[PDB]
Amino acid sequence: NHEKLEDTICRMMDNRAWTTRLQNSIRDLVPEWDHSLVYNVLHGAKKLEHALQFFRWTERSGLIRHDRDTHMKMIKMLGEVSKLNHARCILLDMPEKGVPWDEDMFVVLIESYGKAGIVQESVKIFQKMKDLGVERTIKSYNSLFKVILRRGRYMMAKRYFNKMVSEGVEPTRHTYNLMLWGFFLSLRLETALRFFEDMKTRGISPDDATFNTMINGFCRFKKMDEAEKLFVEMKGNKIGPSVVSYTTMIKGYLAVDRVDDGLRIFEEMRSSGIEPNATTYSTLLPGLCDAGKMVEAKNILKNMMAKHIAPKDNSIFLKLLVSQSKAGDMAAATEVLKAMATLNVPAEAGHYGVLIENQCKASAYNRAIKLLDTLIEKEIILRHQDTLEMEPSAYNPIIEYLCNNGQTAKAEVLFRQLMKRGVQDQDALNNLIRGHAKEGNPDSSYEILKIMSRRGVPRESNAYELLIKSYMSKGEPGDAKTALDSMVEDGHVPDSSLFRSVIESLFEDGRVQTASRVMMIMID
Amino acid sequence: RKLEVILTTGIEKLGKGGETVKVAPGYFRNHLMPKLLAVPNIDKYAHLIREQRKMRNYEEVKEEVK
Amino acid sequence: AFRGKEMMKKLVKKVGAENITPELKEKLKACVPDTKVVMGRAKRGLYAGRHIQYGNRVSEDGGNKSRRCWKPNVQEKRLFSYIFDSHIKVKVTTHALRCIDKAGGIDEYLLKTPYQKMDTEMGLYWKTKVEARYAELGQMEVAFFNPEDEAKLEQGFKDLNIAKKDARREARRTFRK
Amino acid sequence: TAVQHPWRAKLDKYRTELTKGVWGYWEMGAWKPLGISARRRAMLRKEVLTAG
Amino acid sequence: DVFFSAFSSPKLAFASSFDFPRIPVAGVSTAFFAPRMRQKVRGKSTFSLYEVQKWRTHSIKAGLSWQ
RNA sequence: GAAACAUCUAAGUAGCUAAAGGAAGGGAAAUCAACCGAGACCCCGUUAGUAGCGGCGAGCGAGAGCGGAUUUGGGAUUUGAAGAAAAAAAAAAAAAAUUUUUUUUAAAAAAUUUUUUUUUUUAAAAAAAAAAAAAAAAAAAAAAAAAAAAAAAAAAUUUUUU
RNA sequence: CGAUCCUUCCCAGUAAAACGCGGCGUGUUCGAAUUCUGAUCGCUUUUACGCGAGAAAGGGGGACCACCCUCUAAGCCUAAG
Ligand SMILES: [K+]
Ligand SMILES: [K+]
Ligand SMILES: [K+]
Ligand SMILES: [Mg+2]
Ligand SMILES: [Mg+2]
Ligand SMILES: [Mg+2]
Ligand SMILES: [Mg+2]
Ligand SMILES: [Mg+2]
Ligand SMILES: [Mg+2]
Ligand SMILES: [Mg+2]
Ligand SMILES: [Mg+2]
Ligand SMILES: [Mg+2]
C-alpha cells in the first residue's frame, strides 16, 4: 500500500523549515524527476509559500525545466491568493525559457488583478495583449467584460463591445448576459433593451440565466408585477424553471411590501423541483421577521436542520429571536437555542440574554433561572472570540429578583463573571449588598463594598445602614463599629438614632472603650 | 581524533572506492587531499561522488555483466 | 577599538557613499567585523580569533610576580584549495587548523564562516573571491562519454600528437637548414 | 479609545502561543522556546491582572 | 555586490590562469569530459576534439600566498 | 605606607600608543530573590566603612533592596488554515417528573466622474460614439509652486504655452 | 512606473573540563545535550502518516546530589536622563 510522493513532500514542507538540509533530503528522496511529480506536489501543497518555494527551487537547482501546465498552475494559485507581482514576474520570464505565451496565462492574470480592484491594469494588459503577439479572440473579451462591469464601466463596455464586433467577432449568450447584468446594475434601461434587441437581431435563443438577468434587473427597479409577467413569459417560452429565478422572485416580493407572497411562491416551489437551497432560506426569514408572522417562521426553522442547511448571514438568527420574542411565543424559542448550538455555531451571551430578558419580563422566573444556569455553567461570558455581549437589561432585573426574593450566591457568581469582561454597574452591586444583608451573611456585603472601594464605584449612604443593622441583629457590635468607621471614612454621617443603637449595643456587651471611641466622633 | 573521508579509488589497506573510511588528519590533509584520493565526508561531495560513480559504473556493470 | 567603523569608512570611500541606500548601510554594518585585534601579525594570517595575552608569572615560594605573555600557536602551512587546484600558504593557528578540519577544507571554511567572523580585511577579500568562483562553478555542467567514443577520441588525440611532433621537428630542421 | 487598553494587541497576538507553555514547548520532538520572553510575558500578565 | 566592487579589479574565469578544477571530475577520474555552461534552452550535443578533455595520468602546480 | 622588607600598598594611577563620535559606551534577562515576589540600561542618595578580601597585618572594600532623574520599547512573530465509523438535528410512537428509548432522512452580494461631436424633447433633462481619469499601495527621480496684466517662442502683430 | 517577497547568515569546534594568569575574561589541549520524513505504544481504518496517550533539552540559585523556583547563551536595532 505504502505512501505516495506528493503527500510526503508536502509533509516535509508542512513540518520543517525550508533549509538546505531539508532540500538535501527531498533531492535524495526523489528517484526521478518529471512534471507529473511537480504537478502533484504543487496541487497538494498546503500553503502557497511552500508551493512557491518548491517551484523556484526545482527550476533554479537544475533538476528539471518546467512546462506550460506547471506555469499555468503556478499563476492560477498565485492569482487566486492575489500575489500579483509574483505572478507577473513569473509570467514575463517565459520566452527566455523557451515555452510559448498563451492567452490562458493572461486571462487568469486579468481576473487576478480585477479581484483586488486594480482593473485598470487588467485593461492595460488587455490593450497590450495583441502588442505582445498573442491571439485575443473570445474568452479574453469575456473576462474583460466580466471584470469591468463588476466595477460598473458601462460606458467603457459599450466602446469595447464596438471594438469587439468591429474586429470580426461573433458575440454569444455569455457575452450578452455578462454585459446585460452590468447594464442593469448601472441603471441603464434603454441600454439594456438596446443590447437585448442586439441579441434579437443576432439570433440566439435566450436561456435560464438570460431570463434571470431581466428579472433581477426588474427586482432592482422595484417593479415586481412586471417581473411576474416576465416569469410567466419564461414559462410560455419553454425554458426550465430555475431555483435562482424563484429565489429572486421571493427577493422581489419582500423588497417592498409583499411578505406573505414568499410563502405563496414557496407553495409553487414544488413545481420547480429543488426546494431546499441555502439562498431562499437565507433571504426569506428577515422579511417576515420585519412583518411579524411566526408560524411560517418556526416550521421552516424546524426544516432548517431537517436537511442540514445554513444561511448566508447569521445575524438573521438574532433578528428572528428578537422578533419572535416580541411576538410572544416563548415555548418555541427553546428550538432556536438548540438550533444555534447544533449546526456549527457557538451560542453567545447576547443570544442567551434576550431569552433570559423575556422570561424575566413575563412571569417565567424559574425558566429564567434555568437559562441562567445553563448560561453560566457553559462559561459563555468568558469567551474571547464571541462578539455580542450580555445587555444591561439581561442582568439588571434578574440580579434584583435573585437578591430580593431568594439566594444571592449565584447572583454574585454571575456578576463576578461579568466583572471579568465588561461590567461595573452600580445598580446590581447595590442590590447584591441588600440581598446579602437580608439573607444573613453581612460579610459578603462588606467585601462587595470593599470591591466598590478598590474599583472606585461611588458608594451610597443607605447601603451601610443595612450592613450596620445586619451586624447588629446577629450580635457583632465590634463588626458594627468597624462598618461605622468605614462609613465615616467614606464620608457619610449617620443619624443619632443609629448612634444611640450602636452605643448601647457596645456598652451592654462590655465593650466600653469602643463605645467611647464612638462617643469621640459623635462629640466631634 | 579521526576524520571521515570518501574513497575515490582503491587504496590497499583502506578499502574500495565509494566507501567512507576513518583516517588520521595528518594522513588526509597532507596525502589524500592534494592527490584527489579522498574527499571530505560532507554532503555536496558525497552526492557528487555517488552520482559520478553511478554514471560511470553503469557502463562498467553493463560491460561486466553481459 | 571601533575597527568596524574604521573599516566601514574605507569601504564607503572605496565604493562611493551615493551608491548605498540606508537599508544597505544598515545591512553592511552587520557584516564588517567589530572584533578586538591589535597585534600586527594577526591581520596578515588566519588566526580564528586567537590573540596574545599579557599576565603575571608568580614564583612558588616567594609569590613574586613579574610580567610575561602567552602567544598563540602560529604555524606556517600550505593548505590545498579545491577551486584553485593548488596550495595556499598561510599562517594559521592550530585552532584555525582544527576548525578547517571540522569544516572540510579551507574553501568550505571560507564559505561557511560569515563575514563578521573573518576578523580581517584579507579574510573578507578571500571569502569574497572564493564565493565568486563558486558562483561561477554553480552554472556549469560536464558531459561524459561512452567507451567507444573514449577509444575514438583517444585515437584522435594520438593522431594529433604524432602529427604535431612531426610538423614541429620538420619546422626545426628546416629553420636549421 | 485605542490607548485605553494598548496591551490587547499583544494579548491577541500571543493568545495562541501563551497556552502552550511558560517558557517553551516541545515541537516535533525537540524543545522550542516560546515566542514571547518571560519578562515581557510578566509585563503583559500584570497589565491584564490590573484591570480584573 | 558591494563586496565584489570593493575588492574587484581597479578597472569565464575558469581558464588561462587556473583552468578547470579537478574536483568536478572526482567520482571517475579516467574519463573524457566536456565542461560547458548550462543554458536555459536545451543545448547541442556536437563535441569536437578540441572541446574534450582528460587529465591524463600524469596529474592524479604553483602556490598562492595569503597576503 | 607597612614605622626595616619580599606577598600586599601606591594603582590599573602617571606615562607612551591606536581608533571613533558630538557625545561614546550600556541596554530590553540563559537577571535578582526566596516558595512571598521584582522586572532593560546609565547617573545621584542610603544601606555602610557593614558583609567580604588580606604577611586575616597595614590596608582594599561590594551586590540586592529602598528614595530620586529619565520614563519606551521595536523586530523575527504568528495564520485565516481562502469556500463503512463517530457526533447532532427534523417527523411518528411510548414512559417519568424538560428528560430516556426505537423507527425513516456565470446570477439569487459586487457603486463613478470629467471633456469633445451629433441628436430627441420642455436654458431644463436625456439618446448615440470618442478620449480619459477614480493607480502616487511603496519609494526615488524630474519639471513645475495661487488671481490679473507686460515680454519670448509656435501657429493664423494677434491667440495659446512659457 | 506599478500593489514591491526573491535572502550576510547553512548557525557546535559552542557551553563545560584540565593546567597557567586575570577586571566571570583569556593562552595551550580537549569537548556535550532533545527532532532532522521525529520516534514508541494503543485503535479502527481492516491494511493511513489519521486519532489518542506517556516520557523526552539546557543555564543559574557560594563545592556537590535530590526537590523546587526562575531564565533561554553560543551578535538584532534603539531616544532621554
Ligand atoms: K619608614
Ligand atoms: K630601607
Ligand atoms: K546608542
Ligand atoms: Mg616602608
Ligand atoms: Mg591594584
Ligand atoms: Mg591614563
Ligand atoms: Mg568630531
Ligand atoms: Mg547615544
Ligand atoms: Mg512565580
Ligand atoms: Mg528604584
Ligand atoms: Mg549552584
Ligand atoms: Mg545552594
CB contact, 8 Å: A384 with chain D? Answer: yes
Nucleotides of G under 7 A from a protein CB: 2-6, 8-11, 13, 20-22, 25-31, 34-39, 47-49, 55-57, 70-73, 75-77
Strand partners, C54: C69
* CB-nearest partner of E22 from B36, B48, B51: B36
- Please count the residue pairs, one from chain B and one from chain E, whose beta carbons lie less than 8 angstroms apart: 35
A377 alpha carbon – ligand 9 mean position (Å): 30
Contact status, residue A75 vs residue A40, Cβ threshold 8 Å: no
Sheet containing B38-40, strands listed edge to edge, beginning at the edge strand earlier in sequence: B20-23, B3-7, B38-40
Q: Of residues 4 to 43 in chain D, which lie within 7 A of strand G by their beta carbon?
A: 22-24, 26, 28-31, 33, 37-39, 42
Distance CA C8, CA A227 (A): 78
Nearest CA in chain B to C145: B56
Query: C-alpha grid cell for residue C21?
Result: 541606500
Helix (H, G, I), strand (E, B) or coil at A252: helix
Residues paired with residue C81 on neighbouring β-strands, in sequence order:
C86
Q: Which residues contact C93 (CB under 8 A, 6 or more apart)?
A: C46, C47, C48, C50, C72, C73, C74, C75
Q: Distance between CA atoms of C106 and C104, rounded to whole angstroms?
A: 7
Q: Which chain E residue is nearest to residue B58, measuring alpha carbons?
A: E28
Phi, psi dihedrals of residue A270, rounded to the nearest 5° = -65, -30
Contact B45, B33 (CB under 8 A): no
Distance, in Å, from the CA atom of A352 to the CA atom of A418, rounded to the nearest integer, reads: 14
Rounded to the nearest angstrom, the distance between the alpha carbon of A24 and the centre of ligand 12 is 47
**Residues of C in Cβ contact (< 8 Å) with B34:** 80, 87
**CA of residue A362 to ligand 10 center, whole Å:** 60
DSSP H or E segment with residue C87: strand C86-93
Calpha distance A322→A320 (Å, rounded): 6
C70 touches strand G (CB under 7 A): yes
Flag if A97 and E38 touch (Cβ within 8 Å).
Answer: no
- Contact between the CB of A307 and strand F at under 7 Å: yes
- Which sign does the torsion angle of CA A129, A131, A133, A135 carry? positive
Kind and range of the H or E element at A278?
helix A278-291
Which chain E residues contact residue C115 at CB under 8 A? 3
Residue C7: count of CB within 10 angstroms of its CB:
16
CA of D21 to the centre of ligand 12 (A): 27
User: Which of helix, strand or coil describes residue B5?
Assistant: strand
How far is it, in rounded angstroms, from Cα A302 to Cα A294? Answer: 12
Are D52 and A419 in contact (CB < 8 Å)?
yes
Q: What one-letter code names the amino acid at A133?
A: G
d(CA A283, CA A304): 13
Cα separation, A119 vs A173, whole angstroms: 23
A25 C-beta less than 7 Å away from strand G = yes
Q: How far is CA C129 from CA B42, C140, E7, E13, E41, in A?
A: 22, 18, 9, 12, 29
Q: Pairing between strand C86-93 and E63-65?
A: parallel
* DSSP letters for A60-79: HTTS----HHHHHHHHHHHH
Give the containing element (helix H, strand E) for C56. Answer: strand C53-58
Asked if residue E28 lies in contact with residue B52, where contact means CB atoms within 8 angstroms, the answer is yes
Nucleic acid strand F: bases within 7 A of protein CB: 6-8, 18-21, 25, 28-29, 38-40, 75-82, 88-91, 98, 105-114, 126-135
- E43 in contact with C at a CB cutoff of 8 Å? no
C-alpha cell at position C64: 613574586
Q: Report phi then psi at A82, rounded to 5.
A: 65, 55
In 10 A of CB C151, how many CB atoms? 11
Count how many Cα atoms sit within 13 Å of the Cα of residue E13 in the half-sphere of its side chain. Answer: 11
Which chain D residue lies closest to A418 (C-alpha atoms)? D52
d(C-alpha C56, C-alpha C73), whole Å:
20
- Between the alpha carbon of residue C80 and those of residues B39, C105, C130, E16, the distances in Å are 12, 8, 13, 20
- Residue of E22, E26, E60 with shortest CB distance to B52: E26
Evaluate whether C130 touches E64 at the Cβ level (below 8 Å): no
D6/D17 Cα distance (integer angstroms): 19
Q: Which residues of chain A are within 8 Å of residue D28 when distances are taken between CB atoms?
A: 15-16
- Cell readout for C116 is 563578521
Check CB contact of B63 with chain A, cutoff 8 Å.
no
Distant-in-sequence, close-in-space partners of A337: CB < 8 Å, separation ≥ 6: A347, A351, A352, A355, A371
Q: How far, in Å, from the CA of D22 to the mean position of ligand 12? A: 24
Q: Which cell goes with A453?
A: 472601594
Q: Residue A347 carries which DSSP code?
A: P
A445, exposed or middle or buried, with CB in 10 Å at 0-12, 13-18, 19+?
A: buried
Q: Is B55 on the interface with E (CB under 8 A)?
A: yes
| Long-range contacts (CB closer than 8 Å, 24 or more residues apart) made by E42-50 | E42/A65, E45/C143, E47/C143, E49/C153, E49/C156, E49/C157, E49/C160
Query: Measured between alpha carbons, how far is A481 from A501 in angstroms, rounded to an integer?
Result: 11
User: Is B16 in a helix, a strand, or coil?
Assistant: coil
With beta carbons less than 8 A apart as the criterion, state whether C24 and E2 touch: yes
CA distance B45 to chain E (A): 9
Q: Resolution limit in angstroms?
A: 3.0
Task: Residue count of chain E, please give it.
Answer: 67
Q: Which approach determined this entry?
A: cryo-EM
